[PDB]
Design a protein around this ligand. Structure first.
Ligand SMILES: CCCCCCCCCCCCCCCCCC(=O)OC[C@H](COP(=O)([O-])OCC(O)COP(=O)([O-])OC[C@@H](COC(=O)CCCCCCCCCCCCCCCCC)OC(=O)CCCCCCCCCCCCCCCCC)OC(=O)CCCCCCCCCCCCCCCCC
Ligand SMILES: CCCCCCCCCCCCCCCCCC(=O)OC[C@H](COP(=O)([O-])OCC[N+](C)(C)C)OC(=O)CCCCCCCCCCCCCCCCC
Ligand SMILES: CCCCCCCCCCCCCCCCCC(=O)OC[C@H](COP(=O)([O-])OCC[N+](C)(C)C)OC(=O)CCCCCCCCCCCCCCCCC
Ligand SMILES: CCCCCCCCCCCCCCCCCC(=O)OC[C@H](COP(=O)([O-])OCC[N+](C)(C)C)OC(=O)CCCCCCCCCCCCCCCCC
Ligand SMILES: CCCCCCCCCCCCCCCCCC(=O)OC[C@H](COP(=O)(O)OCCN)OC(=O)CCCCCCCCCCCCCCCCC
Ligand SMILES: CCCCCCCCCCCCCCCCCC(=O)OC[C@H](COP(=O)(O)OCCN)OC(=O)CCCCCCCCCCCCCCCCC
Ligand SMILES: CCCCCCCCCCCCCCCCCC(=O)OC[C@H](COP(=O)(O)OCCN)OC(=O)CCCCCCCCCCCCCCCCC
Ligand SMILES: CCCCCCCCCCCCCCCCCC(=O)OC[C@H](COP(=O)(O)OCCN)OC(=O)CCCCCCCCCCCCCCCCC
Ligand SMILES: CCCCCCCCCCCCCCCCCC(=O)OC[C@H](COP(=O)(O)OCCN)OC(=O)CCCCCCCCCCCCCCCCC
Lengths: 70, 167, 96, 347, 80, 98, 114, 110, 105, 313
């Protein structure tokens, strides 16, 4: 009956679900387990570049906390 | 190369203008002007003017060149084209090789030969685009500007309804 | 619902802007030492480069005034490598 | 055209010229020119024949190219000064481009080639608007930017305008093309005294607007387009031939008519500045304009060309037209030379 | 005014809804008690750095610390 | 000055010389005119963004609006000529010589 | 024209604040409350002199008082501060609103101990 | 730079698909044929109606272009001026549409 | 015909977009705010004829702020001398001009 | 790693387009009291594969085009502006996170009528050109109310950022304060993509003069436009719950809402007859546009009278 349309809709749902899950896991993997730093405004970019300079490894996401100061 | 990306898009912009300015037809003229509007929008986008580049795409190529192609496609249906094309391209590439070898050129004013990244600022603007605030100041400051522009558009509607009436 | 939530969002925006404001003097001191660092380095390398050239004044300010002029992108990143120049001159524009 | 819409459109034309006059920003100058052109295009197409569409096409292309050159001159001023004040330009090249754009907007030579066609195509009242009102805006901008104008450029444009507008109108039989070459010559006369004393520029502007206003009001009052149609006025209305006699003799600058006043003050100001040769060649050129005004007066007033039988019927209908201010504009345009030191009110 | 309105709401209801929404949009911010608070919120959002003042000696209404009592605060914002 | 400014000015002069040498079509004249407008937009935008002069960021939008209304007026003129003759040829427009 | 006077690198050596942006952001309100006076003296000197060369001693006082601030945190409440800035650092926009219970823990521990 | 890589990838995939779609069924051989429309051979009639709706779109698109920075303009200090000019622009768009209505502009594209 | 209506009626129609030193949105400075402020405050009220020859130094500084011609000339001279001494082999770049050195803040 | 992200964007787009044809034929089957395709594969799941291989080995229609260049460039521009509309979509984290993603999508969708116009001019049939001009005038007509409805909705957002339009709708769906804008948006996007009950390219079509291959490329560009406008409508009016630690919650939630909305397109195309061309021109210019201007004045004036002006950042 009506539930015969549901395998096609399920395959279409998986083929819409691959991009979102894919880009979320790619952003979380390529930034050390965290979301990609959203830098829309230049203050956020200044802080991002400051992180990239203070990390020592030329990666903005490698955070340095209180262990890096004395 | 990549430091010269605004320069590369500017060269492609001039090549597009020599491409349609030799005028094969209004159809291919519109085609070349569309490609030139896209690459000039890219020139705008590489300085941080994202809203003005999207005004190019949304208004220029979105409304006006669509209406140009719309009128061209229903109201129309060489040697000199190719010759003027290669003439303008030889002028442009002579200028390109001059500024490649000399790092300085004077056509009318004097011009630099460096990459055009050298004309920027090194600071940050906080929590706003500067150009976004400047266009947001159209309503809070530009009272006279909005009045004369809106009145010109209202008279534009009136004028087009007068002269396309035929009677 | 949109009234209450946009008022709460304005209060959170004021919190973020005041966290920014409390951080701005430290970032301003870091920025000042950054630009003076890079100008002093470019001045010393201009001193060790411009020794053959006659009539050259190392550190010749092209302005007639003695006011501190904000340093240009090319006045800081002039001698530096192209990857640094691109990451500083189109970094914010090209960032995703 | 709807009369309410006609009033709104004419007030939009006047608003565009007022915005050119009052504003201190270059973008608002350009906006005033755009509003002026955009609202004046249906004034030319009030009758909707192919000649008006051709005339508005030529007018639109010339004023559009001039407005693009004006915005390019403004933009290069923003390069070399970083600011938008309407004052002298801080670049020679922006000065040359803006002088060429204002020359294309005034119809001065060698950008003059649109003036007789657009004057011929459109009606007489829209031609009056074109030849009087549309000169007010670029002459105001030239009045404001004169500390940057290249002297040799504006004098070359001026003498070439006077020579072409003089050596053109001798052949013509159309009245509107005669007024158009008169326009080209008088704009040469206005821009030649511009860098020496601009009060004489404004004086020539007023006296030219009064004389062209008188002439097109007479041309509307008799509905004449050619020389012969003007010359058949003597049996329809004898006084109109006398009025076009005295006003055409004024527009070439006969003493002691008031059209002699502007160019006499111009030669009076150009010889103060040790230019004896240039107003001499200009006054030598103006005698040709005076000659074909003499030819037109021999056609119209001092002789009587033979009429038809149908004129006897038009004897029995006096003119039901709005001859607005025609005796005032005739009295001002001929009998004003004893009031020559009235020019100081323009200082 | 009650007959013609029912007439036009019978024949052209879309334009009646358009003019009614537009009339509310024009007249209602001059009647609403919150239009004061929109100004008070927008000028209390600190986009720029609060550049401090040189203490000449007589400014009793300018604080010396953020947690000082004097100075304009935002209790109306946290309460509303 | 900057070299991209020279290229945008050369783009403007190229579309100028394309506008000043008519081939056949009036639409080609209007397209050269709007290429002139486009190069004005790019040049003004680069100067206004480069100097950080914030209040002129609303200027290129006003340039775009006014000259696009100018182009709409030009298209209506071209359509009236296309109703008169059939094409948009510039050699049809030789009535006002006499 | 003139020879522009740039201060020496030996006059620019100072111990930097080598922490991240989420670390500075998670301690920003307590920083602006506690490190008020050298920060405001430096920004007052920075607007009035209009010259970063005339502000380097005040910049070093800012850079020293900020390090004293992070020392006075690190002696007492390193664990709740770490728990707070890790949660701030997870987010993309670094929302304060995603991290309210760690904020309550950190502000409670600071208000008790300091 | 991620944007231009993505645009290059999408344009390249589309160009590749178009090349494959025009040149894969040319590998078939089948045959050749003669191959000799409601209107037969008449010239295209120019519709004034289509041009009028295109210019009406262009003018209302320009008025939209003036209306676009309102989400950024609500953040101003000067709210009375901002709100007055915003309602002024939308009312001028409504006057443009009303003049387009009442003086018989929207005819046979109603 | 510069009919100064804005000074007569007192309205401020377009003096606000005119110069870079004017009241900008949220106090955003232009990149040449100081130079244009000094040139405007030099040339105020002295007229254009005395301004083109007495305030020439401020306007030279300001035009060099706008177009940066002398600075690009100086950078081209220094960078061409550096490229020449690299190509001759007579010079080496320092660690802080090659990227192996951990940038400061 | 980023090229992996672009490929995992634009391969499942094309697969979702491929199975949207199966979902269309099945859902329009059971709404017409019949079955859709169920013989080609198990439950019909091999129908679009068989149909695509049918199209790509069909003999080319081989026309003498007026322009070869526009005839090649129309499917290229159609597919490019079908695939580059997905890149700013916050689902939950966008591929190209940009500040002006809304205005980007409006601009790139307003550019896509050149494919219709070029594909219509490149045919030699004057009647095909006339049908293409009618489709172009339809789409550029409804672009107006797309832009104004979009502006009036984003007055509640605070900026053009698409990712902020999730954070805007944590408390309530945005269809509750803006359901008239939502329903005029819905019918205006139904009329954008030449979708029934507006599809006047069935009656000549603009792309009927192409071969079967390039017609299939137009077809998959149009269905990518359909799925994209439904996902943009879902993001913009039904923005779902977003836990930043588990993004798959938002991904499943907008996926279910977007599939219900695309099936609502399929359920509207099988329920109403076609508008005549003057009827949908009337529907826009005299019915949807006055209400859109009125609601634009209302959504300008409403945050000022509620003191609810949203944050820019
Ligand atoms: C200051 C600047 C002033 C500029 C001129 C302003 C007035 C005219 C503007 C509009 C216009 O052209 O109207 C037509 C015009 C009549 O001219 P026309 O169209 O040729 O009429 C021909 C027949 O005379 C029509 O006859 P009619 O039978 O139809 O009716 C007779 C009519 C009846 O009159 C009335 O009804 C007037 C009384 C009511 C007026 C409104 C009151 C409110 O009287 C007249 O027409 C007599 C002439 C009126 C004066 C015209 C000249 C005005 C001065 C122009 C500038 C001169 C500068 C000289 C400088 C010399 C040194 C350089 O003016 C009027 O109808 C009213 C004139 C009011 C004069 C006021 C003077 C002081 C102003 C301050
Ligand atoms: C991703 C979406 C789907 C992509 C496209 C579909 C995937 C499969 C593509 C290949 C399909 C098979 C080849 C094309 C179709 C051939 C049909 C046909 O009639 O062929 C006869 C034709 C010609 O046979 P013919 O000699 O009988 O020609 C018929 C015409 N007469 C008789 C009048 C001369 O075969 C070919 O042209 C062969 C081409 C190569 C086939 C593949 C070889 C092996 C590749 C590994
Ligand atoms: C119909 C027109 C209705 C609106 C008229 C303008 C209302 C308005 O906002 O005015 C205050 C606005 C803005 O005032 P404001 O108080 O917002 O400006 C603050 C001052 N600045 C910009 C320096 C921060 O305009 C003016 O004060 C004067 C300029 C325009 C005046 C109107 C010209 C109309 C000409 C008609 C011919
Ligand atoms: C995004 C989520 C999903 C969205 C909704 C999905 C379901 C809805 C869609 C169902 C299928 C529709 C298929 C297409 C239909 C096309 C035909 C059609 O409907 O034409 C539109 C019809 C056209 O009318 P018509 O065609 O019936 O009649 C001809 C028109 N007249 C009568 C004028 C001559 O209606 C509209 O244009 C209305 C549009 C929506 C209006 C919403 C207004 C809301 C109320 C505002 C306030 C009211 C009170 C006033 C103020 C009070 C103050 C106190
Ligand atoms: C996000 C999800 C996306 C999913 C995309 C794909 C959706 C559909 C997936 C497949 C569904 C099942 C297909 C079953 C096909 C028929 C199987 C079969 O048994 O065919 C029999 C046929 C003839 O066999 P024969 O031995 O000759 O018969 C005599 C037997 N007594 O044998 C044959 O015809 C030869 C064998 C044909 C096998 C074809 C199998 C399907 C291939 C589809 C391509 C995509 C595969 C999946 C990709 C995504 C997952 C990785
Ligand atoms: C330093 C200088 C500063 C500035 C100083 C001031 C400069 C003022 C310049 C004024 C120039 C006026 C030019 C015309 C203005 C518009 C009026 C006009 O042309 O109206 C046309 C109108 C058409 O009516 P319509 O119904 O179309 O009939 C036509 C046939 N059916 O009606 C008609 O056709 C009616 C016919 C008669 C109209 C006569 C109008 C004369 C007005 C001008 C008077 C002279 C100039 C002013 C005095 C000198 C000022 C310098
Ligand atoms: C001041 C507030 C703001 C006002 C400006 C902003 C408006 C926003 C909406 C924009 C509307 C744009 C178009 C408006 C054009 C109006 C003129 C018009 O269309 O008249 C013709 C029409 C008859 O239509 P017809 O041609 O018969 O239709 C064919 C299909 N049946 O005639 C009609 O349908 C009659 C329409 C007019 C009468 C409607 C009365 C509504 C009253 C509601 C309560 C009072 C609200 C206050 C404002 C009233 C303004 C008049
Ligand atoms: C001297 C200054 C300009 C130097 C460059 C000139 C470009 C080469 C063209 C030379 C003249 C060729 C020619 O015949 O031009 C006329 C043509 C319009 O006339 P058409 O009807 O096509 O041909 C019959 C002849 N009049 O004219 C055209 O079609 C001209 C198209 C111009 C487009 C400019 C492209 C760039 C040219 C170089 C930069 C200027
Ligand atoms: C027939 C011809 C071929 C037709 C098919 C192919 C062309 C048409 C389809 C592709 C259209 C491409 C449009 C690309 C530009 C869109 C606007 C844009 O760049 O927006 C994204 C973003 C703005 O957002 P924002 O967040 O403010 O900026 C980052 C700062 N945080 O900005 C950025 O992030 C800046 C990114 C760097 C600059 C990107 C520039 C792109 C290249 C130039 C245009 C190339 C296409 C030219 C032809 C167009 C069509 C004629």
């Amino acid at each position: 009956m009506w539930f015969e349309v549901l395998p096609g809709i399920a395959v279409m749902g998986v083929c819409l679900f691959i991009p979102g899950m894919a880009t979320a896991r790619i952003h979380r993997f390529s930034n050390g387990g965290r979301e990609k730093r959203v830098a829309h405004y230049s203050y956020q970019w200044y802080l991002m570049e400051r992180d990239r300079r203070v990390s020592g490894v030329n990666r903005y996401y490698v955070s340095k906390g209180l262990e890096n100061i004395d | 190369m990549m430091t010269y990306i605004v320069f590369i898009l500017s060269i492609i912009f001039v090549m597009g203008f020599v491409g349609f300015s030799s005028k094969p037809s209004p159809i291919y003229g519109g085609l070349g002007l569309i490609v030139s509007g896209g690459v000039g929008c890219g020139i705008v986008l590489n300085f941080g003017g994202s809203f003005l580049g999207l005004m190019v795409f949304l208004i220029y190529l979105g409304g006006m060149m669509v209406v140009f192609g719309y009128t061209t496609a229903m109201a129309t249906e060489n040697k000199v084209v190719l010759g003027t094309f290669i003439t303008g391209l030889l002028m442009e590439f002579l200028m390109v090789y001059y500024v490649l070898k000399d790092k300085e050129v004077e056509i009318v004013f004097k011009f630099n030969g460096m990459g055009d990244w050298v004309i920027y600022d090194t600071g940050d603007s906080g929590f706003f685009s500067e150009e976004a605030m400047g266009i947001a100041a159209l309503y809070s400051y530009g009272t006279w500007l909005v009045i004369v522009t809106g009145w010109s558009l209202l008279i534009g509607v009136v004028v087009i309804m007068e002269i396309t009436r035929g009677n | 619902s949109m009234m209450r939530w946009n008022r709460e969002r304005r209060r959170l925006q004021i919190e973020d802007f005041e966290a920014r404001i409390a951080l701005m003097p430290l970032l301003q001191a870091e920025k000042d030492r950054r630009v003076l660092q890079m100008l002093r380095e470019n001045l010393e390398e201009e001193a060790t480069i411009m020794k053959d050239v006659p009539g050259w004044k190392v550190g010749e300010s092209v302005f007639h005034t003695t006011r501190w002029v904000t340093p240009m992108m090319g006045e800081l990143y002039g001698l530096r490598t192209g990857e640094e120049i691109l990451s500083s001159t189109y970094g914010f524009i090209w960032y995703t | 055209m709807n009369p309410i819409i006609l009033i709104i459109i004419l007030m939009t034309v006047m608003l565009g010229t007022i915005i050119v006059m009052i504003s201190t920003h270059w973008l608002l100058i350009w906006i005033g020119f755009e509003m002026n052109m955009l609202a004046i295009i249906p004034i030319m197409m009030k009758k909707h024949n192919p000649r008006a569409t051709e005339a508005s096409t030529k007018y639109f292309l010339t004023q559009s190219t001039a407005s693009m050159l004006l915005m390019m001159a403004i933009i290069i001023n923003l390069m070399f000064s970083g600011q938008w004040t309407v004052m002298k330009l801080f670049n020679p090249m922006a000065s040359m481009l803006m002088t060429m754009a204002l020359a294309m907007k005034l119809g001065m030579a060698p950008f003059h080639f649109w003036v007789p066609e657009v004057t011929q195509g459109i009606p007489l009242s829209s031609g009056l608007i074109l030849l009087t009102w549309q000169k007010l805006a670029p002459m105001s901008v030239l009045y404001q930017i004169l500390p940057s104008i290249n002297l040799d450029l504006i004098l070359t444009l001026s003498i070439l305008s006077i020579t072409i507008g003089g050596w053109g109108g001798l052949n013509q039989t159309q009245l509107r093309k005669i007024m158009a070459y008169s326009s080209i010559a008088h704009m040469g006369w206005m821009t030649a005294v511009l860098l020496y004393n601009p009060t004489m520029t404004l004086l020539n502007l007023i006296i030219y607007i009064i004389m062209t206003s008188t002439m097109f009001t007479l041309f509307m009052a008799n509905s004449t387009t050619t020389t012969l149609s003007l010359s058949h006025t003597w049996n329809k209305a004898p006084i109109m031939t006398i009025l076009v006699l005295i006003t055409l003799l004024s527009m070439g600058g006969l003493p002691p008519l008031s059209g002699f006043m502007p160019k006499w003050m111009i030669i009076q100001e150009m010889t103060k500045n040790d230019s004896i040769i240039l107003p001499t060649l200009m006054a030598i050129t103006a005698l040709l304009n005076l000659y074909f005004y003499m030819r037109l007066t021999y056609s119209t007033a001092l002789t009587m060309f033979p009429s038809t039988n149908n004129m006897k019927m038009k004897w029995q209908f006096p003119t039901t037209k709005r001859m607005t201010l025609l005796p005032t504009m005739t009295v001002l345009s001929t009998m004003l030379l004893p009031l020559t030191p009235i020019l100081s009110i323009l200082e | 005014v009650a007959a013609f309105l029912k007439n036009v709401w019978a024949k052209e209801p879309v334009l009646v809804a358009s003019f009614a929404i537009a009339g509310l949009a024009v007249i209602l911010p001059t009647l609403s008690p919150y239009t004061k608070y929109s100004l008070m919120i927008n000028r209390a959002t600190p986009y720029n750095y609060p550049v401090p003042l040189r203490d000449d000696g007589n400014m009793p209404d300018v604080p010396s610390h953020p947690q000082d009592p004097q100075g304009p605060s935002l209790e109306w914002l946290k309460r509303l | 000055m900057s070299l991209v400014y020279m290229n945008i000015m050369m783009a403007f002069t190229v579309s100028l010389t394309g506008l000043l040498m008519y081939r056949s079509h009036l639409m080609s004249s209007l397209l050269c005119l709007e290429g002139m407008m486009l190069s004005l937009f790019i040049l003004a935008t680069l100067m206004i963004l480069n100097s950080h002069f914030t209040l002129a960021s609303m200027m290129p939008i006003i340039l775009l609006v006014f000259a696009a209304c100018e182009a709409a007026l030009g298209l209506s003129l071209l359509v009236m000529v296309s109703n008169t003759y059939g094409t948009d040829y510039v050699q049809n427009l030789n009535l006002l010589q006499c | 024209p003139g020879i522009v006077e740039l201060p020496s690198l030996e006059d620019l050596k100072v111990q930097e604040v080598k922490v991240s942006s989420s670390v500075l952001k998670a301690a920003a309100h307590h920083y602006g409350a506690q490190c008020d006076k050298p920060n405001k003296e430096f920004m007052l000197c920075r607007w009035e002199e209009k010259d970063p060369r005339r502000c380097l001693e005040e910049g070093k006082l800012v850079n020293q008082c900020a390090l004293e601030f992070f020392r006075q945190i690190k002696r007492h409440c390193a664990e709740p501060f770490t728990e707070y800035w890790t949660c701030i650092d997870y987010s993309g926009l670094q929302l304060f609103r995603r991290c309210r219970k760690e904020q309550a823990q950190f502000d409670k521990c600071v208000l008790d101990k300091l | 730079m991620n944007l231009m890589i993505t645009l290059l990838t999408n344009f390249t995939l589309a160009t590749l698909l178009v090349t494959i779609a025009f040149w894969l069924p040319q590998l078939n051989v089948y045959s050749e044929k003669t191959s000799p429309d409601p209107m037969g051979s008449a010239r295209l009639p120019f519709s004034m109606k289509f041009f009028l709706v295109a210019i009406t779109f262009l003018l209302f698109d320009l008025e939209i272009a003036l209306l676009l920075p309102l989400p950024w303009a609500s953040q101003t200090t000067n709210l009375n001026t901002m709100l007055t000019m915003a309602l002024l622009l939308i009312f001028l768009l409504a006057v443009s549409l009303a003049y387009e209505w009442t003086q018989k502009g929207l005819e046979w594209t109603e | 015909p510069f009919f100064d209506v804005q000074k007569k009626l007192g309205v401020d129609l377009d003096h606000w977009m005119t110069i870079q030193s004017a009241e900008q949105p949220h106090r955003i400075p232009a990149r040449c705010h100081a130079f244009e402020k000094e040139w405007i405050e030099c040339a105020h009220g002295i007229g254009s004829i005395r301004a083109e020859k007495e305030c020439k130094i401020e306007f030279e500084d300001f035009r060099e702020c706008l177009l940066r011609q002398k600075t690009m000339k100086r950078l081209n001279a220094i960078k061409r001398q550096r490229d020449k001494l690299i190509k001759e082999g007579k010079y080496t770049p320092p660690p802080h001009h090659s990227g192996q050195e951990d940038l400061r803040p | 790693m980023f090229m992996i992200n672009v490929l995992t964007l634009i391969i499942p787009i094309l697969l979702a387009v491929a199975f949207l044809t199966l979902v269309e034929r099945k859902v329009l089957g059971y709404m017409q009291f019949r079955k859709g395709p169920n013989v080609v594969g198990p439950y019909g799941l091999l129908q679009p594969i068989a149909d695509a291989i049918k199209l790509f080995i069909k003999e080319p229609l081989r026309p003498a085009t007026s322009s070869i260049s526009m005839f090649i460039l129309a499917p290229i521009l159609a597919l490019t502006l079908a695939l580059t509309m997905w890149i700013p979509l916050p689902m939950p984290y966008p591929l190209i996170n940009m500040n002006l993603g809304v205005l980007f999508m409006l601009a790139m969708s307003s550019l896509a009528v050149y494919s219709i116009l070029w594909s219509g001019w490149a045919s030699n049939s004057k009647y095909a050109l006339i049908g293409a001009l009618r489709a172009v005038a339809q789409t550029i007509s409804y672009e107006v109310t797309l832009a104004i409805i979009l502006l009036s909705v984003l007055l509640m957002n605070g900026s053009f950022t698409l990712s902020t339009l999730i954070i805007t709708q944590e408390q309530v769906w945005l269809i509750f304060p803006a359901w008239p804008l939502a329903m005029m948006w819905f019918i205006s996007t139904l009329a954008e993509t030449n979708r029934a009950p507006f599809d006047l390219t069935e009656g000549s079509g603009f792309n009927v003069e192409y071969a079967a291959g390039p017609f299939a490329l137009f077809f998959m560009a149009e269905y990518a436009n359909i799925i994209m406008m439904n996902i943009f409508t879902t993001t913009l009016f039904l923005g779902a719950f977003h836990n930043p630690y588990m993004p798959e919650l938002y991904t499943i939630n907008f996926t279910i809402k977007s599939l219900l909305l695309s099936i609502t397109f399929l359920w509207i195309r099988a329920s109403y007859p076609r508008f005549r061309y003057d009827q949908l021109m009337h529907l826009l210019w005299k019915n949807f546009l006055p209400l859109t201007l009125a609601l634009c004045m209302w959504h300008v004036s409403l945050p000022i009278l509620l003191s609810s002006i949203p944050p820019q950042t």
